[PDB]
Amino acid sequence: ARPAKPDFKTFPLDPDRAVKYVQQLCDIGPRISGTPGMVKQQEVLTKHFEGLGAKVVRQEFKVRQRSQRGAVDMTNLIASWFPDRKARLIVCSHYDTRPAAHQETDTQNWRKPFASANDGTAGAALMMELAHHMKGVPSNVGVDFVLFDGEEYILDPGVPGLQEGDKYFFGSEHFANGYTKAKAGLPYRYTGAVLLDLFAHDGARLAMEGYSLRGAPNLVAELWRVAGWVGAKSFVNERGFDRATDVLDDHIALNEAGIPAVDVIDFDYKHWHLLSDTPDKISGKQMVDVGNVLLGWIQIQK
Ligand SMILES: [Cl-]
Ligand SMILES: [Cl-]
Ligand SMILES: [Cl-]
Ligand SMILES: [Zn+2]
C-alpha cells in the first residue's frame, strides 16, 4: 500500500428493482392496519431486511380508532443498521394503506381497493432497494429504517368543517413516545429523521414545508445541499405546496420528541388518495435520486 466538501458518494441503486418492489407490495393488495395484507407485508419486509443484514424489531401495540369500538393491532417495524453508534439517524415512512381512496368524488369508488403506491408504499420500497447497499455504506451514525403503522387508518373521514373524522399518526406517536420514555436509559440518541411521503412520482416537486423548516433547519440545509451535489432536481428551494403550506405527517411526533425531522414530500401529487395511485405512477429515477440524497446525508455526518 501507499497513500494516494464532505466525503460521500452515490451508490448503484437500481431504478427498475425499486419500482419492482413497489409493484410487489401493491400486489399484496391493500395493507390496511390490522388486516392479513398488513401481516403479509410485515413478513415480506422482515425477511428482506434480515436477508440483507439488518436487525428487525417489531413495536406491537393496540389502539382504538375514534369511529370504532374494537381494538386494532398495530406494529411498527424497525430495520437497524450499524448498532455500535452513539448517534442514530432515522429514515422513515408509513406502511399502512388508507382504507379508501377518499379523494374520489364518486363514493362508490370508496369501496374499491386502494393501492396507495406513492403513499407509504414507495417509501417502504425505497427502503427495500437501499437495503441492498447499506452494509457497503460507510457511516459515522447508526441508521434505523422505521415503518410506521396506523398513519391513516381512516374508516370515517369526517365531514369537512362539520366533523373531524378518524385519527392519524398512531405509529409515529407510539414510536416517539417510546423514545421519550426510554431516552435517559439509551446508549444512543436520535439526531435526525427523514420521512418519505408522496415523493416518488415523475417530476415530483419536493419543496420545503413549515413543520420541517421550523423543526429541523440544519437537516433541511444538509439534505438540499446533498441534493444539489447529486443532481436530484426534485429537491427545490421553495416554500410549500398548492394543497398546503404546512403538512401534518408522521414527522410531527418525531419533532415533538426532540428529533429534528423533515418530510420529503410533494403534497401536490396528482393521484393523492385516488384509485389511480398505482405503481405505474412511480419513477424509478426519482426513487434513485431520493435514495442517493438519503445515503449522502448519512455519509456526511461526523
Ligand atoms: Cl456497527
Ligand atoms: Cl383524503
Ligand atoms: Cl436541525
Ligand atoms: Zn395518504
Side-chain angles (χ1 to χ4, degrees), residues 22-54:
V22 178
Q23 186 71 58
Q24 178 181 358
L25 295 176
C26 290
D27 283 350
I28 295 169
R31 292 131 280 148
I32 297 163
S33 297
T35 66
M38 169 60 79
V39 172
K40 177 64 174 180
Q41 170 174 227
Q42 290 161 0
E43 295 168 348
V44 168
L45 291 167
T46 297
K47 179 182 182 177
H48 182 78
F49 292 137
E50 287 180 341
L52 290 163

mmCIF file of all heavy atoms in Angstrom, residues 22-54:
data_model
loop_
_atom_site.group_PDB
_atom_site.id
_atom_site.type_symbol
_atom_site.label_atom_id
_atom_site.label_comp_id
_atom_site.label_asym_id
_atom_site.label_seq_id
_atom_site.Cartn_x
_atom_site.Cartn_y
_atom_site.Cartn_z
ATOM 1 N N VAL A 22 -42.123 -1.636 -5.376
ATOM 2 C CA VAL A 22 -43.449 -1.012 -5.261
ATOM 3 C C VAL A 22 -44.524 -1.965 -5.772
ATOM 4 O O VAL A 22 -45.568 -2.163 -5.134
ATOM 5 C CB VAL A 22 -43.527 0.334 -6.002
ATOM 6 C CG1 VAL A 22 -44.945 0.895 -5.883
ATOM 7 C CG2 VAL A 22 -42.517 1.322 -5.450
ATOM 8 N N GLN A 23 -44.298 -2.534 -6.961
ATOM 9 C CA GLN A 23 -45.278 -3.445 -7.542
ATOM 10 C C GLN A 23 -45.514 -4.645 -6.632
ATOM 11 O O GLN A 23 -46.652 -5.094 -6.468
ATOM 12 C CB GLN A 23 -44.793 -3.906 -8.913
ATOM 13 C CG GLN A 23 -45.817 -4.750 -9.657
ATOM 14 C CD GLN A 23 -46.986 -3.913 -10.134
ATOM 15 O OE1 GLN A 23 -46.798 -2.948 -10.879
ATOM 16 N NE2 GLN A 23 -48.193 -4.263 -9.697
ATOM 17 N N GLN A 24 -44.451 -5.189 -6.043
ATOM 18 C CA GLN A 24 -44.595 -6.359 -5.181
ATOM 19 C C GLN A 24 -45.470 -6.051 -3.973
ATOM 20 O O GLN A 24 -46.380 -6.827 -3.611
ATOM 21 C CB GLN A 24 -43.211 -6.820 -4.730
ATOM 22 C CG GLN A 24 -43.257 -7.996 -3.783
ATOM 23 C CD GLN A 24 -41.892 -8.455 -3.299
ATOM 24 O OE1 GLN A 24 -40.852 -7.908 -3.692
ATOM 25 N NE2 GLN A 24 -41.889 -9.471 -2.439
ATOM 26 N N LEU A 25 -45.205 -4.906 -3.329
ATOM 27 C CA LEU A 25 -46.003 -4.537 -2.163
ATOM 28 C C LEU A 25 -47.449 -4.274 -2.560
ATOM 29 O O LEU A 25 -48.379 -4.725 -1.880
ATOM 30 C CB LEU A 25 -45.380 -3.340 -1.442
ATOM 31 C CG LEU A 25 -44.008 -3.604 -0.811
ATOM 32 C CD1 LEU A 25 -43.450 -2.329 -0.227
ATOM 33 C CD2 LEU A 25 -44.087 -4.679 0.267
ATOM 34 N N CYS A 26 -47.670 -3.583 -3.679
ATOM 35 C CA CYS A 26 -49.041 -3.356 -4.122
ATOM 36 C C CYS A 26 -49.738 -4.654 -4.509
ATOM 37 O O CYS A 26 -50.952 -4.768 -4.333
ATOM 38 C CB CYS A 26 -49.091 -2.351 -5.271
ATOM 39 S SG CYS A 26 -48.681 -0.666 -4.794
ATOM 40 N N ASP A 27 -48.993 -5.641 -5.007
ATOM 41 C CA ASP A 27 -49.571 -6.917 -5.402
ATOM 42 C C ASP A 27 -50.041 -7.731 -4.209
ATOM 43 O O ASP A 27 -50.782 -8.697 -4.399
ATOM 44 C CB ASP A 27 -48.560 -7.722 -6.220
ATOM 45 C CG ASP A 27 -48.435 -7.232 -7.653
ATOM 46 O OD1 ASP A 27 -49.249 -6.401 -8.098
ATOM 47 O OD2 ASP A 27 -47.506 -7.689 -8.341
ATOM 48 N N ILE A 28 -49.621 -7.378 -2.989
ATOM 49 C CA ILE A 28 -50.271 -7.966 -1.810
ATOM 50 C C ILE A 28 -51.764 -7.658 -1.765
ATOM 51 O O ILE A 28 -52.550 -8.428 -1.196
ATOM 52 C CB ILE A 28 -49.550 -7.499 -0.535
ATOM 53 C CG1 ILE A 28 -48.137 -8.061 -0.552
ATOM 54 C CG2 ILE A 28 -50.311 -7.892 0.751
ATOM 55 C CD1 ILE A 28 -47.243 -7.471 0.508
ATOM 56 N N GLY A 29 -52.181 -6.545 -2.359
ATOM 57 C CA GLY A 29 -53.488 -5.986 -2.121
ATOM 58 C C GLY A 29 -53.360 -4.946 -1.025
ATOM 59 O O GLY A 29 -52.261 -4.669 -0.530
ATOM 60 N N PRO A 30 -54.478 -4.348 -0.617
ATOM 61 C CA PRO A 30 -54.433 -3.362 0.468
ATOM 62 C C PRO A 30 -53.738 -3.910 1.709
ATOM 63 O O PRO A 30 -53.819 -5.106 2.029
ATOM 64 C CB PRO A 30 -55.915 -3.067 0.733
ATOM 65 C CG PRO A 30 -56.560 -3.270 -0.627
ATOM 66 C CD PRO A 30 -55.822 -4.469 -1.211
ATOM 67 N N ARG A 31 -53.044 -3.013 2.400
ATOM 68 C CA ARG A 31 -52.337 -3.318 3.636
ATOM 69 C C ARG A 31 -52.868 -2.410 4.739
ATOM 70 O O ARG A 31 -52.127 -1.656 5.383
ATOM 71 C CB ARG A 31 -50.828 -3.148 3.422
ATOM 72 C CG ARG A 31 -50.226 -4.190 2.474
ATOM 73 C CD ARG A 31 -49.359 -3.505 1.418
ATOM 74 N NE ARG A 31 -50.207 -2.971 0.367
ATOM 75 C CZ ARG A 31 -49.964 -1.875 -0.355
ATOM 76 N NH1 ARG A 31 -48.942 -1.092 -0.086
ATOM 77 N NH2 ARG A 31 -50.797 -1.559 -1.354
ATOM 78 N N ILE A 32 -54.181 -2.459 4.942
ATOM 79 C CA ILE A 32 -54.826 -1.658 5.976
ATOM 80 C C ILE A 32 -54.400 -2.188 7.346
ATOM 81 O O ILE A 32 -54.192 -3.396 7.529
ATOM 82 C CB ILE A 32 -56.351 -1.760 5.780
ATOM 83 C CG1 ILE A 32 -56.759 -1.171 4.415
ATOM 84 C CG2 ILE A 32 -57.084 -1.098 6.933
ATOM 85 C CD1 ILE A 32 -58.161 -1.583 3.967
ATOM 86 N N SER A 33 -54.233 -1.291 8.318
ATOM 87 C CA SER A 33 -53.865 -1.739 9.664
ATOM 88 C C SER A 33 -54.787 -2.860 10.130
ATOM 89 O O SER A 33 -56.005 -2.811 9.929
ATOM 90 C CB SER A 33 -53.980 -0.594 10.661
ATOM 91 O OG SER A 33 -53.074 0.427 10.344
ATOM 92 N N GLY A 34 -54.198 -3.871 10.767
ATOM 93 C CA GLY A 34 -54.967 -4.913 11.416
ATOM 94 C C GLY A 34 -55.513 -5.970 10.491
ATOM 95 O O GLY A 34 -56.420 -6.701 10.894
ATOM 96 N N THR A 35 -54.998 -6.079 9.264
ATOM 97 C CA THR A 35 -55.535 -6.996 8.269
ATOM 98 C C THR A 35 -54.484 -8.002 7.821
ATOM 99 O O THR A 35 -53.273 -7.776 7.979
ATOM 100 C CB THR A 35 -56.048 -6.256 7.025
ATOM 101 O OG1 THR A 35 -54.941 -5.645 6.342
ATOM 102 C CG2 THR A 35 -57.107 -5.213 7.388
ATOM 103 N N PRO A 36 -54.911 -9.101 7.198
ATOM 104 C CA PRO A 36 -53.937 -10.068 6.668
ATOM 105 C C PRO A 36 -52.960 -9.484 5.666
ATOM 106 O O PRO A 36 -51.805 -9.923 5.635
ATOM 107 C CB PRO A 36 -54.834 -11.136 6.033
ATOM 108 C CG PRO A 36 -56.105 -11.077 6.883
ATOM 109 C CD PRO A 36 -56.298 -9.610 7.129
ATOM 110 N N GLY A 37 -53.368 -8.515 4.838
ATOM 111 C CA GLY A 37 -52.419 -7.926 3.900
ATOM 112 C C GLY A 37 -51.272 -7.230 4.613
ATOM 113 O O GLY A 37 -50.113 -7.305 4.183
ATOM 114 N N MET A 38 -51.583 -6.541 5.719
ATOM 115 C CA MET A 38 -50.531 -5.935 6.530
ATOM 116 C C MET A 38 -49.601 -6.990 7.128
ATOM 117 O O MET A 38 -48.379 -6.816 7.131
ATOM 118 C CB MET A 38 -51.150 -5.034 7.602
ATOM 119 C CG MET A 38 -50.148 -4.568 8.645
ATOM 120 S SD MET A 38 -48.757 -3.606 8.026
ATOM 121 C CE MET A 38 -49.532 -2.010 7.835
ATOM 122 N N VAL A 39 -50.157 -8.096 7.635
ATOM 123 C CA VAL A 39 -49.315 -9.167 8.165
ATOM 124 C C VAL A 39 -48.373 -9.689 7.082
ATOM 125 O O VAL A 39 -47.173 -9.894 7.320
ATOM 126 C CB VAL A 39 -50.190 -10.294 8.757
ATOM 127 C CG1 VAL A 39 -49.318 -11.484 9.119
ATOM 128 C CG2 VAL A 39 -50.983 -9.778 9.971
ATOM 129 N N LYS A 40 -48.900 -9.911 5.875
ATOM 130 C CA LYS A 40 -48.058 -10.392 4.776
ATOM 131 C C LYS A 40 -46.945 -9.403 4.457
ATOM 132 O O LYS A 40 -45.795 -9.796 4.259
ATOM 133 C CB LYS A 40 -48.914 -10.650 3.539
ATOM 134 C CG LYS A 40 -48.121 -11.087 2.316
ATOM 135 C CD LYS A 40 -47.433 -12.415 2.512
ATOM 136 C CE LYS A 40 -46.780 -12.865 1.211
ATOM 137 N NZ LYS A 40 -46.087 -14.172 1.342
ATOM 138 N N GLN A 41 -47.277 -8.115 4.387
ATOM 139 C CA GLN A 41 -46.250 -7.103 4.145
ATOM 140 C C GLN A 41 -45.158 -7.160 5.204
ATOM 141 O O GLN A 41 -43.961 -7.024 4.891
ATOM 142 C CB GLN A 41 -46.893 -5.715 4.118
ATOM 143 C CG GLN A 41 -45.903 -4.580 4.115
ATOM 144 C CD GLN A 41 -46.555 -3.236 3.941
ATOM 145 O OE1 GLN A 41 -46.093 -2.459 3.129
ATOM 146 N NE2 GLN A 41 -47.587 -2.917 4.760
ATOM 147 N N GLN A 42 -45.553 -7.305 6.474
ATOM 148 C CA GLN A 42 -44.557 -7.382 7.543
ATOM 149 C C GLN A 42 -43.612 -8.561 7.342
ATOM 150 O O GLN A 42 -42.395 -8.437 7.547
ATOM 151 C CB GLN A 42 -45.247 -7.475 8.900
ATOM 152 C CG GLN A 42 -45.941 -6.184 9.283
ATOM 153 C CD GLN A 42 -46.978 -6.390 10.367
ATOM 154 O OE1 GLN A 42 -47.177 -7.507 10.842
ATOM 155 N NE2 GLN A 42 -47.635 -5.322 10.776
ATOM 156 N N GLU A 43 -44.154 -9.706 6.908
ATOM 157 C CA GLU A 43 -43.307 -10.875 6.666
ATOM 158 C C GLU A 43 -42.341 -10.620 5.513
ATOM 159 O O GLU A 43 -41.142 -10.932 5.604
ATOM 160 C CB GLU A 43 -44.175 -12.092 6.370
ATOM 161 C CG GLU A 43 -45.025 -12.504 7.571
ATOM 162 C CD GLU A 43 -46.116 -13.530 7.268
ATOM 163 O OE1 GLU A 43 -46.407 -13.793 6.080
ATOM 164 O OE2 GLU A 43 -46.695 -14.065 8.239
ATOM 165 N N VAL A 44 -42.856 -10.070 4.408
ATOM 166 C CA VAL A 44 -42.019 -9.779 3.244
ATOM 167 C C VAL A 44 -40.879 -8.847 3.633
ATOM 168 O O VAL A 44 -39.705 -9.085 3.310
ATOM 169 C CB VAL A 44 -42.881 -9.179 2.117
ATOM 170 C CG1 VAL A 44 -42.002 -8.600 1.019
ATOM 171 C CG2 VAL A 44 -43.854 -10.218 1.559
ATOM 172 N N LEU A 45 -41.216 -7.751 4.316
ATOM 173 C CA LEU A 45 -40.207 -6.762 4.673
ATOM 174 C C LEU A 45 -39.204 -7.319 5.669
ATOM 175 O O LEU A 45 -37.996 -7.067 5.543
ATOM 176 C CB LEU A 45 -40.874 -5.509 5.235
ATOM 177 C CG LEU A 45 -41.666 -4.715 4.188
ATOM 178 C CD1 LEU A 45 -42.546 -3.692 4.860
ATOM 179 C CD2 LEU A 45 -40.753 -4.024 3.185
ATOM 180 N N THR A 46 -39.679 -8.059 6.676
ATOM 181 C CA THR A 46 -38.769 -8.601 7.677
ATOM 182 C C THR A 46 -37.759 -9.531 7.033
ATOM 183 O O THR A 46 -36.551 -9.414 7.281
ATOM 184 C CB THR A 46 -39.561 -9.323 8.777
ATOM 185 O OG1 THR A 46 -40.405 -8.375 9.446
ATOM 186 C CG2 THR A 46 -38.628 -9.994 9.790
ATOM 187 N N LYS A 47 -38.237 -10.451 6.185
ATOM 188 C CA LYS A 47 -37.330 -11.388 5.526
ATOM 189 C C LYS A 47 -36.346 -10.660 4.620
ATOM 190 O O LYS A 47 -35.152 -10.988 4.588
ATOM 191 C CB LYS A 47 -38.143 -12.403 4.727
ATOM 192 C CG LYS A 47 -37.310 -13.418 3.973
ATOM 193 C CD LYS A 47 -38.182 -14.359 3.155
ATOM 194 C CE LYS A 47 -37.346 -15.408 2.437
ATOM 195 N NZ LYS A 47 -38.201 -16.374 1.694
ATOM 196 N N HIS A 48 -36.818 -9.636 3.908
ATOM 197 C CA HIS A 48 -35.941 -8.904 3.002
ATOM 198 C C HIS A 48 -34.825 -8.200 3.773
ATOM 199 O O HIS A 48 -33.624 -8.317 3.443
ATOM 200 C CB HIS A 48 -36.789 -7.885 2.252
ATOM 201 C CG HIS A 48 -36.011 -7.094 1.262
ATOM 202 N ND1 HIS A 48 -35.644 -7.602 0.033
ATOM 203 C CD2 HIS A 48 -35.493 -5.844 1.333
ATOM 204 C CE1 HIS A 48 -34.949 -6.684 -0.617
ATOM 205 N NE2 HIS A 48 -34.841 -5.611 0.148
ATOM 206 N N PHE A 49 -35.208 -7.449 4.805
ATOM 207 C CA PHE A 49 -34.224 -6.687 5.562
ATOM 208 C C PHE A 49 -33.248 -7.604 6.288
ATOM 209 O O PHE A 49 -32.034 -7.359 6.287
ATOM 210 C CB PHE A 49 -34.916 -5.745 6.548
ATOM 211 C CG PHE A 49 -35.687 -4.605 5.909
ATOM 212 C CD1 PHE A 49 -36.947 -4.259 6.388
ATOM 213 C CD2 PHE A 49 -35.153 -3.878 4.846
ATOM 214 C CE1 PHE A 49 -37.645 -3.205 5.827
ATOM 215 C CE2 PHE A 49 -35.858 -2.811 4.293
ATOM 216 C CZ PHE A 49 -37.100 -2.489 4.789
ATOM 217 N N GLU A 50 -33.751 -8.664 6.926
ATOM 218 C CA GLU A 50 -32.857 -9.584 7.624
ATOM 219 C C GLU A 50 -31.906 -10.262 6.655
ATOM 220 O O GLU A 50 -30.723 -10.466 6.973
ATOM 221 C CB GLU A 50 -33.667 -10.633 8.385
ATOM 222 C CG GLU A 50 -34.347 -10.079 9.635
ATOM 223 C CD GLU A 50 -35.144 -11.115 10.403
ATOM 224 O OE1 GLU A 50 -35.498 -12.174 9.841
ATOM 225 O OE2 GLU A 50 -35.407 -10.862 11.588
ATOM 226 N N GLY A 51 -32.392 -10.601 5.459
ATOM 227 C CA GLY A 51 -31.541 -11.265 4.497
ATOM 228 C C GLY A 51 -30.430 -10.386 3.985
ATOM 229 O O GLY A 51 -29.474 -10.895 3.397
ATOM 230 N N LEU A 52 -30.541 -9.072 4.185
ATOM 231 C CA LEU A 52 -29.518 -8.134 3.742
ATOM 232 C C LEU A 52 -28.697 -7.568 4.893
ATOM 233 O O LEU A 52 -27.837 -6.708 4.670
ATOM 234 C CB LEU A 52 -30.153 -7.047 2.869
ATOM 235 C CG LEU A 52 -30.610 -7.615 1.514
ATOM 236 C CD1 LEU A 52 -31.585 -6.684 0.823
ATOM 237 C CD2 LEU A 52 -29.401 -7.883 0.616
ATOM 238 N N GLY A 53 -28.906 -8.065 6.113
ATOM 239 C CA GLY A 53 -28.043 -7.766 7.237
ATOM 240 C C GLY A 53 -28.649 -6.898 8.317
ATOM 241 O O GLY A 53 -27.963 -6.640 9.306
ATOM 242 N N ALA A 54 -29.890 -6.432 8.181
ATOM 243 C CA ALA A 54 -30.453 -5.567 9.211
ATOM 244 C C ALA A 54 -30.980 -6.398 10.373
ATOM 245 O O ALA A 54 -31.427 -7.535 10.198
ATOM 246 C CB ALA A 54 -31.616 -4.761 8.644
#
